[PDB]
């Protein structure tokens, strides 16, 4: 039998989650090839093999596409989680509100120098199965001086917020920080009255959201049954 | 089998994701037909041999098209990211609790599956179009986006117009990202028909991610064509 899920994989990062999904597609492909080869060697048993492959193609390709789509989503999640507001040094308040010294909210991203989640040479960089995905939402700003994502006060113009903001509005800058908050969501397959099933993911205010994730997991489940039916050909 | 929706006008990231899914739906129909022919009945052996030799290229480009669809789905959601406007406040109270002026991240979260409605329906040489995001550029003087907002009157919304006046201070917000389209059109040359390399080194996704997927999509096109012959 073909093991779609990698037991020796510990998903702890978005890039890890994307490689786990790609592993599903690689394993799904091997099961399809073996079914194709079994029907090819039988050239009746070849008629029922081709029949099983054709009947399961819709379920196979829908879940294959869903695993790939989830790998794509996690790849973008792994890049966007780096989004930050940059610190800006304080400036005497009268000059901080107009040209040439206006204090700016500066977006910044950290862009991979390779294909995201991959090395330059092309290699990856990261019981019932568990599907784990990472999701983003708006970060929560601070609520007092010297906390993230706030206007930074200091008695001395020119001060870097990293050295400590004060309750002092003589000069003002910006203490930056992460624009997003990243969290994991998980669903662990379990035996159901008629087979196996994934509990729903709850994540209503994130990117991706749970409607997007649950739709894809449902299709991954159809890939798993399609692969099991494919393994039954050579068994 | 026509993998490419010729009558598609891709102008949004969600439209780009649906174009990618059209490719996968068309690719499926080519394999299904190829399997239906094989079901009928050495000819049966010929089809199987093809379907098998081309499965590797087929699933590689199929996965790349669906991967790109997943990437464009997130692009369509995060492109909503903004820094919120914050009303001005007397400067001495603006630097500490409880009035501290905050840089407030904000997203717009789809209430459905992104790029789909509740019912589940979607919301020449071919061209592949994708949308990418990059850091937005802040303004350089008062009342321009992504700057501290001065005003003479405390409690003033920045939409009233920021001034060269630091009596009260707030935040003039705006989009956190800029979103632009990248494209590549299949080109006839002595190399056959190939998609030119995209250059985009400062965006999410970047060109190395995109160019790798595009190369695989070209291999899908070649696989669908061989599947059509049988």
Residue numbers in the entry:
A (entry chain A): 22 to 64, 94 to 176, 186 to 294
B (entry chain B): 23 to 63, 94 to 175, 186 to 292
Please, what does the article write about this entry?
Therefore, at the heart of antigenic variation in the African trypanosome are the NTDs of the VSGs. These large subdomains are elongated folds centered on a three-helix bundle scaffold.
Of note is the fact that both structures were obtained with proteolytic removal of the bottom lobe (contained in the C-terminal region of the NTD sequence). This cleavage occurred spontaneously during crystallization experiments performed with full-length VSG21 and the NTD of VSG545 that had been produced by limited proteolysis with Endoproteinase Lys-C (LysC). Superpositions with predicted models from AlphaFold (which were accurate enough to solve the experimental structures by molecular replacement) show possible conformations of the full NTD for each protein. In this subdivision, we split the A3 class from Cross into A1b and A1c (which correspond to classes N5 and N3 in Weirather, respectively) based on differences in the top lobe architecture (e.g., the smaller top lobe beta-sandwich in A1c compared to A1b and the presence of a second beta-sheet over the middle lobe in A1c that is not present in A1b).
